[PDB]
Amino acid sequence: TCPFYKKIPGTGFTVDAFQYGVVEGCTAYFLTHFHSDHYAGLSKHFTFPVYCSEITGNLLKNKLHVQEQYIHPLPLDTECIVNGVKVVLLDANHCPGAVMILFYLPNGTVILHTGDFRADPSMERSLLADQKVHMLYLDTTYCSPEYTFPSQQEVIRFAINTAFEAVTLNPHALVVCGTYSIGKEKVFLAIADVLGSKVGMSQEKYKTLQCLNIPEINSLITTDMCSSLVHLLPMMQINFKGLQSHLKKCGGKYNQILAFRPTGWTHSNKFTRIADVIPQTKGNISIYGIPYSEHSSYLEMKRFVQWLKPQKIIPTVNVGTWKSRSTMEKYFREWKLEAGY
Ligand code: NI
């Protein structure tokens, strides 16, 4: 049965609700982004209207074989009308194609659903600036003050500098980057760019990336692993055994692996700046865990909400324990008292 925080009141709409069969009273299903926890249940047999971004639509058609007639892509930053309700899709600064949704209800209520997001001050100058929001359904993934992390830019600078130095010192080193879903493409693309290489990957992963419009993609990615010194592997293979084996598969082209595991958060951020990060090493294999997040830090989230000043906040993450729920509600109270709303 569909939870309440996936239902938009005063509409026949749901958000990221495909794993519950036919939702009672749902006339249109919105999908914020192409991550499995959100799309789970879509397939070729789906025959209700799905509203999403252009990129998300491309992925629905090609990867899941959803039929074209049921896919309704909307342009960003554009007032559109769905079953008589004005809607706008806004960039969520999450993975490619990820959106937030603004709903303008017939009675005058305005609702923002963030989907998954990484709050940024650039959002303070989109269509949000111009009006009040009565209800915010908020991505609360990292809603606690221990979750502090660097900017994506600082993390990429660290990665590029590390990889460039390693391959310069040993031209026979291979760089590996882990992946488990779309998102975090900048990690591997920025590395390949500095080394003068393409990123080699499986045919299935190549086809996924080709679905995303990213300009100059024929230009940065390939299925020819032999001609590439940056390889993309499943995140599960980013460990000493998986990587020893990969190295075996390369037929003596390389004698060393430097691997990156972009993670959300790790407790080393509580004690260590980006510049201080060091690898785990075993033989000729080093693994760096880097804090590349596509979700708001605590402070990013706090600033977004104190700017927006919603009348009611509905959390969409960490809602399953009484202790988590209580903790988040206590922060929301603080934020409201400090900002004067
Ligand atoms: Ni996500």
From Swiss-Prot:
The keyword Cell cycle applies. One of its GO terms (biological process) is double-strand break repair via nonhomologous end joining. GO terms for cellular component: fibrillar center; nucleoplasm. One of its GO terms (molecular function) is beta-lactamase activity. Disulfide bonds: none annotated. Keywords: Cell cycle, Cell division, DNA damage, DNA repair, Hydrolase, Isopeptide bond, Metal-binding, Mitosis, Nucleus, Phosphoprotein, Ubl conjugation, Zinc, Zinc-finger. Expressed in brain, heart, kidney, liver, pancreas, placenta and skeletal muscle. It is found in: Nucleus. Signal peptide: none annotated. Induction: During mitosis. The mRNA encoding this protein contains an internal ribosome entry site (IRES) in its 5'-UTR. This 5'-UTR generally suppresses translation while specifically promoting expression during mitosis, when cap-dependent translation may be impaired. Belongs to the DNA repair metallo-beta-lactamase (DRMBL) family. May be required for DNA interstrand cross-link repair. Also required for checkpoint mediated cell cycle arrest in early prophase in response to mitotic spindle poisons. Possesses beta-lactamase activity, catalyzing the hydrolysis of penicillin G and nitrocefin. Exhibits no activity towards other beta-lactam antibiotic classes including cephalosporins (cefotaxime) and carbapenems (imipenem). Binds constitutively to TP53BP1. Binds CDC27, which is itself a component of the anaphase promoting complex (APC). Binds PIAS1. This is DNA cross-link repair 1A protein.
